[PDB]
């Protein structure tokens, strides 16, 4: 959950350069983005989650 | 040989690089995800890993009882009007939605099942009548036995049919029941039918529902309260808690994102906004 | 017929174990032993059909 | 008996 | 390899059919898993088997639809989009049984100067979701199986409000990848992604995969065939650029049984 | 190798002394204690001792279930203009003080927690209505699972939080819970904030409270009466026992002087003075 | 899977002992072994860098 | 005594200067703009606790007859391996006179007390751009 | 390699940081001397030395200039350059003495359409020429050392004639090297050139140079860093294109010596 | 089978 406590800190991208294309090209694009976590990442406490629910 | 308690691996202590292995540089159209740990793009430090991932095994995340039901009786006095009140539950993981979302982060499963029963009584008219200790009568009726058409018929009997006959008071009954699919494994997702409409057969008749396949896919519960009726009204719940143990699990899936609509995976206007609004560049 | 297994002690005031009697015939009415086996994710995070070297260029 | 894991 | 070979430069051979290319990104085996003939520990009708190998294991093209600048995606089923393909349709209308799995050949070339990306996913058991608000589970056998033409996903969705003759439908909502889950999330299904300016094509090799080891082929589809636009096709500075996108796919290993006469479905 | 209930030395005899060795002289400033014996300064006689210190050892100290909370609930009539009452509790050994002073002996600890839970119930109105029997739910909530907002919504479901169905008259409900902290040992105090105040952040946005981390702990303790209302109202108490079995302690402590004011360290005006009048020259 | 342990014996009437069978998987399930060591008081007492000789002068 | 655990991290933070026992608590009457400070009673060591009793932490005793330094070597103590610096203080020390200052007759003598400490074995990790924190 | 390696894509990581390029042309380490720690053979100041390791020795980004048709070229001065940055700042300037090697990356991207070329020429002892043609040896601290900011080579010697408030400034004459000798003939210097059909980035690899083992960086600077258009930046027919240049540069192996209280200079 | 302490 959020915690000030635990917090993880910053994610941040910037442009380095700057995106050059030549003529007849778009001149805007879209980047995507993809999470994962590595060999060593691991969770515990088991509990239900808020992100279904069942009103009535 | 790896365990679900095994550590997880330790961290090697890395150093400066400049060469042409690059790790950090991949391409998702593949189809992969890039195996990277933190030692291929910083310097990292000897770390002796203790964590491990024991309590996130299909076992582990599986091992609770969930609610997935509660079915009312009653025993109400003999001069009433209305019929004694008995339940019939047609079996099933759907009509709640806490282990429904869990089971549907994959495909197909095996497992066997666990059920407990808690069962709870009250006093509904502001008599002060009494009543004694109520004996329940918990029958599973498998798809194709005579259902229950009152409460003191002739199938309570249950010469074959499992019963359980709970005593009001005591612990919460329990009974285990094996894999008892059909199939190899259930099926949490069913993309098809389970008629084939014909050209030389009307509409009707080929008719069946989409993803639907046993109609009567596990058979039912029936509940009744044993005691004959009594003067004082009393109103009982049983609540059905299922865990399923000894599980395995196939073909992994993104989980339910807007609220259940039904037995399918069918969706309501009004409920496909889950997410909430962030500015792209606001932490 | 009394499976002896260790526990993973967490927690301290040798090996700590404890025992388990299984007391049915129908191994459904066992409860879980919860000695349960890890995978590569593999089939999921590298299902192509060419070995991926980390270190190399995805493509070439 | 008993079996040892 | 120093003889020339290369990761993008592939050759598949099925029957009497070939596809080549000169710009993939790797190929998909689906789980890990080749597609495999039922094998006798796993076996259950046991009436000798119908494998009409090279006559069926051949790669067959579907018609080729269109991408946009508007189009929000387009699906399939298997065996649905193959079943008026050659003699793999016929052994499957003849039998009551069958399994199948399947090379995926999802092509679709450009420019250097065009972008897009197109999320090629193929899901096991791909229930989608219908167009009522008044009735769940509702979606006809005839609107669930388009055979070879597919569906296409919506960015909107827009309920049924006809309830004397209800339409029947699949609503398949793109972000929720028609079935209530999140489109994000179905990189955990086996899959590539065509993006223009590194590939153009995807290949995905399927395993027959069920809670079962032979079924109704003609009641159930195994597998689905997902394809949306992750990153919207553009090409300089055209306000409607186009480009098609074919899809060629293989049955492989597959196996019949329940031999009668032949099924005519009702499917308009 | 020494444990627990050995016993402790024996005096061994020793006579007169006439020396430059000085045992009784000693120098505090150097932060020590002298290591002294009886017969470092008088004349012993040989002594085989019997005692031990089994009684005083960490575990043994603690080895006792002390109340750390009582949580009210009730069920009342269907009519009733109030709310059914279910009871919602942040865990913590600091609502109470008795344990809550024994555990600050030590700066940290690590231990296994046992939780019982003894439950009473009541009637309330001069009535003569009966309540047929109550089964209790308890269910823990953890940190970020969605909290209980009527004693009948879909959290109570408990699908993956652990509950317990307590029913009533039987033996007090208990379970056990590993050592579950975040850090390698349970502080007991925590010098610090939860927030950095940052210069170009606003004061608000920087603040926290002083010697608190995570806000929520451990989570809550939630309780209903699972029973339907009935006409005539029952109020019930949940008291919550805690010991802490399998216990480590670290870095010892002046025990609390005055009487406690809330979570902190902090006191009182007028509670400051613990102790009483004793003349100097008087025994 | 029985751990056979000694009891101190208090008030009398060989060893006499007592058993114990740990029922469950989790050793946060236990109950307390009451088997406990002690130690020496030393790094609250003589916390001092040089050890310190009683008979002798403690400031030299 | 209105609010608990409401110091301040500027107030609970002096830096260098340090901070001071009092003989008398005295409670901040201020609602409106709180001093938000702490109110160390010196017989209750600050926290509430006898100060005849702090000599069970490790400690020295400056007798003015007998030395005129105390050093303590002090290992890193936490719950923690490593933890913010910044959020969380390891360790206090307390300087209070057991036994009061007295010189020849004369009524106001004075002494210096000088602190000179060194970090040990420090380490740190996850390095970024540098804290900046509100410390007025 | 057959698997896949090239002189063209490299990665660099120093402490938390990671450098990617997939259009190098190999990368330079001068006169062929990796940095390296002061040995104890060749040792002077006698303290225990401070060597800041991961704190200083990572990857720092300095403002990105940019390279325009009227360009005439840029130069920065080693630590100078580096004075700022993070704990290596820091830790310059609390001690009288400090030594370093650099890993310098210089970033420079555009497409197959433009062209030009920056020569990146790593400079030992610097030593640029004044503005004034009264008085030689006048630049003063504070314009010899611009920090990250750099300075700029000009075309046209233009001498300071305000003798009342002299500039004190440096006219560094771009084919004269800024320092009175051909520029053509600066390419004996460690060097790469940006050539971009052919590379997006320079590479160099720079060891601690001077006449002494240690000395004050304050003081002194050990490396100049000089990029200079060789040949002009174009783009198709624009006549104002423009692309960046950023410059990334890693200390490596510092060491210091001399610990006290904080230099704090007079910069401007 | 049995430990002995
Ligand atoms: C006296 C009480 C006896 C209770 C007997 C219950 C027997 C029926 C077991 C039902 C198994 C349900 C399994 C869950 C659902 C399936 O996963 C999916 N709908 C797919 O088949
Ligand atoms: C069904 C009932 C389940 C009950 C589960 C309780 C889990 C939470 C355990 C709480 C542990 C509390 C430990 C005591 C307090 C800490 O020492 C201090 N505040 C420092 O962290
Ligand atoms: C293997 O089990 C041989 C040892 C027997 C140990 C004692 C068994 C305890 C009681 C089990 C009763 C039977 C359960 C139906
Ligand atoms: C080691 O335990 C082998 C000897 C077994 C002795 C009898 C066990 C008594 C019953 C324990 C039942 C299992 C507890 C889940």
């Keep these: 959950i959020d915690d000030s406590f635990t917090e993880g800190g910053y994610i941040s991208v910037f442009y380095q350069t700057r995106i050059v294309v030549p003529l007849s090209t778009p001149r805007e694009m879209d980047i995507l983005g993809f999470v994962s976590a590595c060999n060593d990442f691991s969770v515990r406490l088991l509990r239900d989650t808020t992100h279904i629910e069942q009103k009535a | 040989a790896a365990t679900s308690r095994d550590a997880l691996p330790n961290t090697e202590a890395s150093g400066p690089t400049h060469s042409k292995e690059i790790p950090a540089l991949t391409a998702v159209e593949t189809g992969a995800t890039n195996p990277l740990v933190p030692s291929d793009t910083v310097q990292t430090r000897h770390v002796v890993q203790h964590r491990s991932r024991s309590e996130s095994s299909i076992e582990s995340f599986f091992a609770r009882g969930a609610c997935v039901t509660i079915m009312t009786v009653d025993n109400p006095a003999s001069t009433t009007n209305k019929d004694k009140l008995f339940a019939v539950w047609k079996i099933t993981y759907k009509d709640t939605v806490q282990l429904r979302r869990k089971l549907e982060f994959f495909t197909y499963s095996r497992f066997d099942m666990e059920l407990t029963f808690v069962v709870t009584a009250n006093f509904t008219e502001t008599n002060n009548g009494h009543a004694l200790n109520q004996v329940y009568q918990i029958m ?73 396949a046993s109609l009567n896919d596990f058979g039912i519960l029936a509940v009744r309260v044993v005691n004959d009726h009594n003067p004082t009204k009393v109103t009982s719940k049983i609540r059905v808690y299922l865990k399923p143990k000894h599980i395995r699990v196939w073909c992994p899936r993104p989980p339910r994102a807007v609220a259940y609509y039904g037995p399918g995976v069918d969706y309501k206007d009004g409920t496909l906004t889950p997410l909430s609004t962030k500015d792209l560049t606001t932490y | 017929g009394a499976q002896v297994s260790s526990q993973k002690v967490g927690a301290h005031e040798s090996t700590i174990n404890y025992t388990t009697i299984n007391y049915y015939r129908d191994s459904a009415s066992n409860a879980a032993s919860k000695q349960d086996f890890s995978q590569d994710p593999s089939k999921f995070t590298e299902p192509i059909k060419d070995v991926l070297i980390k270190t190399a260029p995805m493509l070439n | 008996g008993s079996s040892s894991t | ?236 500075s055209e306000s409607s650029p186009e480009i098609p996108i074919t899809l060629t796919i293989a049955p492989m290993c597959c196996e019949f049984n329940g031999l009668r006469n032949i099924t005519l479905p009702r499917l308009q």
């Design chain 5, 1 to 236: 390899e120093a003889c020339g070979y290369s990761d993008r430069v592939l050759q598949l051979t099925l029957g009497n059919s070939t596809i080549t290319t000169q710009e993939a990104a790797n190929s998909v085996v689906a789980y890990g898993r080749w597609p495999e003939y039922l094998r006798d520990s796993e076996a259950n009708p046991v009436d000798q088997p119908t494998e009409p190998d090279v006559a069926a294991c051949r790669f067959y093209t579907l018609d080729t639809v269109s991408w946009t600048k508007e189009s929000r995606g387009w699906w399939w089923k298997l065996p649905d989009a193959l079943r008026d393909m050659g003699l793999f349709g016929q052994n499957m209308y003849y039998h009551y049984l069958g399994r199948s799995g399947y090379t995926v050949h999802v092509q679709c070339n450009a420019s250097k100067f065009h972008q897009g990306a197109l999320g090629v996913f193929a899901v096991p058991e791909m229930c989608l979701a219908g167009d009522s608000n008044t009735t769940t589970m509702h979606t006809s056998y005839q609107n669930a199986n388009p055979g070879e033409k597919g569906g296409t996903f919506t960015g909107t969705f827009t309920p049924d409000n006809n309830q004397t003759s209800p339409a029947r439908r699949f609503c398949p909502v793109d972000y929720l990848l028609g079935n209530g889950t999140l489109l994000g999330n179905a990189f955990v299904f086996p899959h590539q992604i065509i993006n223009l300016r590194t590939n153009n094509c995807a290949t995905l090799v399927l395993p027959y995969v069920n809670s079962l080891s032979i079924d109704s082929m003609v009641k159930h589809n195994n597998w689905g065939i997902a394809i949306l636009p992750l990153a919207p096709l553009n090409f300089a």
């Design chain 2, 140 to 212: 599973y009726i498998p798809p194709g036995a005579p259902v229950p058409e009152k409460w003191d018929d002739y199938t309570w009997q249950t010469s074959s049919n499992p019963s359980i006959f709970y005593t009001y008071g005591t612990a919460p009954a329990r009974i285990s029941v094996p894999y008892v699919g059909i199939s190899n494994a259930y099926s949490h997702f069913y993309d098809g039918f389970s008629k084939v409409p014909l050209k030389d057969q009307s509409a009707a008749l080929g008719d069946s529902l989409y993803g639907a």
